[PDB]
Symmetry: D2
Subunit: 217 residues, 4 copies
Amino acid sequence: NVIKEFMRFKVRMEGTVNGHEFEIEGEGEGRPYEGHNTVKLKVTKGGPLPFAWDILSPQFSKVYVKHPADIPDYKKLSFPEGFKWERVMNFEDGGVVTVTQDSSLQDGCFIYKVKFIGVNFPSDGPVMQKKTMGWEASTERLYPRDGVLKGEIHKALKLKDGGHYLVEFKSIYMAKKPVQLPGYYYVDSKLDITSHNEDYTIVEQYERTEGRHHLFL
Amino acid sequence: NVIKEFMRFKVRMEGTVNGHEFEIEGEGEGRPYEGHNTVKLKVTKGGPLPFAWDILSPQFSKVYVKHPADIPDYKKLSFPEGFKWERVMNFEDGGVVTVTQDSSLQDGCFIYKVKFIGVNFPSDGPVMQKKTMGWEASTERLYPRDGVLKGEIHKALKLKDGGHYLVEFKSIYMAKKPVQLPGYYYVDSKLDITSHNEDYTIVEQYERTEGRHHLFL
Amino acid sequence: NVIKEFMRFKVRMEGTVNGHEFEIEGEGEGRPYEGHNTVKLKVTKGGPLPFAWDILSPQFSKVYVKHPADIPDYKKLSFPEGFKWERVMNFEDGGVVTVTQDSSLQDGCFIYKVKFIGVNFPSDGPVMQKKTMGWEASTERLYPRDGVLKGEIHKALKLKDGGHYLVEFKSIYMAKKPVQLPGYYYVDSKLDITSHNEDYTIVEQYERTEGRHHLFL
Amino acid sequence: NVIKEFMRFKVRMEGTVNGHEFEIEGEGEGRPYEGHNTVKLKVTKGGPLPFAWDILSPQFSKVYVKHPADIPDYKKLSFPEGFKWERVMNFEDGGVVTVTQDSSLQDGCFIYKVKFIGVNFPSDGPVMQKKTMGWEASTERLYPRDGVLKGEIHKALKLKDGGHYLVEFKSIYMAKKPVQLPGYYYVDSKLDITSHNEDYTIVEQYERTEGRHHLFL
């Protein structure tokens, strides 16, 4: 019973976007059984970033998803050893990102290590021109496969000139030792940028995230 | 108004799958403000279908979606002229379908005409080996774009031997006269095959479908 | 045997693009063992088309591909019964087309029947705004799979205001009577529009197309 | 000038595939104006790798492509400063890789630094089951866009028990300074594994690669 009602975390990311290398370090905290967490990030290398912060924000904590008692909480059940997760983001104008992450627990602190590679973003598109204004709230479709947990999302970044910039997410959640899987279910999420300095070298985020069955079941 | 609390519809489909031609005709009914409708289909040419009925079932009625008052009901507003809808289905083993449809109103009955082309299904896959057993309930992400309404879904067919077979839907809803569009929102659906003979030449379906904002808003 | 060194063909297409229905009829001729053929097309219904002709031109004859003696010519061998072909076109701005075709033979005359559905073309993209100026020459990668022949191409339309508009082709060629398949090989093609009236309701085309092994073999 | 008729290179890769971290160091040499080069790799962290080596082999040197004098050799022109390249690999069973690379020149040796993230490979697919046995020779379609050079390839791995495993490559070559771009053209390549130990912790490769116009031009 190592996951307490209040848990902190530390995170480090090493990333590249369109050839630009960067490193980010941060700290966060939250209420894993309530579905709330916050994180504060500093760009330690490669700042100011020449692309939109918004593509990085969902890579900084699903052990914090609230689950109903009848849905196995695969990510919480994976501790204390923890889990790895990986992701594809397919952007509608041809950008592609892959992400790989390790989640562990030491001394009561979650430790998150992230690597990120984004490629093929057009020079005049909204990522490289910094035209995005945050994510809409989203709904992930999850299911078990291959002994692990997978999920997909149709997400959207709001645009300064109006309209949306569409991104498909595909994620894989992989316990370090096999633990109990849920069935077909959904996770609702809303991620807010709650603070940032003028060139996004210091950034604060809040996420609400909760799992559930389809409403018609 | 012109759309009554109870409305009947007639539908005809001409299609092809992996070089196999077929035609289907049917009749349905439902309650457009309550979010449900039913339909009875007969394969009138090309039966018995050498592929899974389930890939056809979502092409047989979104004027029937229940919408809250604060979300403009674009498809209902499009009548009496009505609307056209188009779709891509991307299957995880490479099958691809496009669909085009016309929806009109004639003497108090909705009239649906559907054209369907499905290609590249593997000979050994669940579609051509008839290994599927219905869709999970689903959730569509919709937004306005290009003066029309668009939406995407991550759907899944249950496999008879266990597991899921994954399908991405992208739809386009196009009113024949430009009427009020909604913002970013979601539609939940659940489609059930309620009757079928052994070779699926006579089939009946039931769908529940309703629009809503994201739960966290 | 049945395929002479000069052969004529007739073709008919029923199609839809972004809700616009049309029909085209044509007549062609060529030298199947030499790798060239020509065709003249007339829009009989739905002209003038509200989109670029170029997306239709490659749907009007691969029995005319020149093959070296050591690569089985699947499509020629399929006659007199003939073959079916299907295809996906994935356009980089989200347009998707599927196509299904039947090829038959009547005394010296090939008979081509095509159905085409194209969806999700942006209103202001180069297809709906008629901004394309023909295809580059291309190179298809083919291989046997599932007892039929498949092939993929990275193609490109030239744009009037310079640059290219990218399209991926996936094709499936299915003989109506089992005949010998080749292994992994390539087909080079170049299709030219050689005449058109102002609104593209009358068009003539020339195609050169020849198969070969990879040059390093 | 700086690119001599014979050139050596050193390479290091940091990668992750399905959660498995690894590092590889290597050394190569070749004839940049003739289109031939060889490389020798050793795994230095993470061996033996739990996946097919073949997905790594094309990430180890396009400055060695032979170009005819009439096609601008953008990568050679980029030196001595050099170029960066990025890549997406889309595998037919859902695996996705992104790659990012820096190419520089030091003490008369090219220096290559690669980062690689591979995700979503099925546990029973041919990559994680090590069921592949090298690439077919291939042909890349290249064009200028957005101030850089881009290319795509339909590639294929041979399967030990027969058949092929298909993979689409999208590459982006980004000179560190704005050196002249070519037009629409093709690059043929053939990569062979020439030596390896059983667990692929020691591997030797050879590549032939040459650029050209389409053959019909």
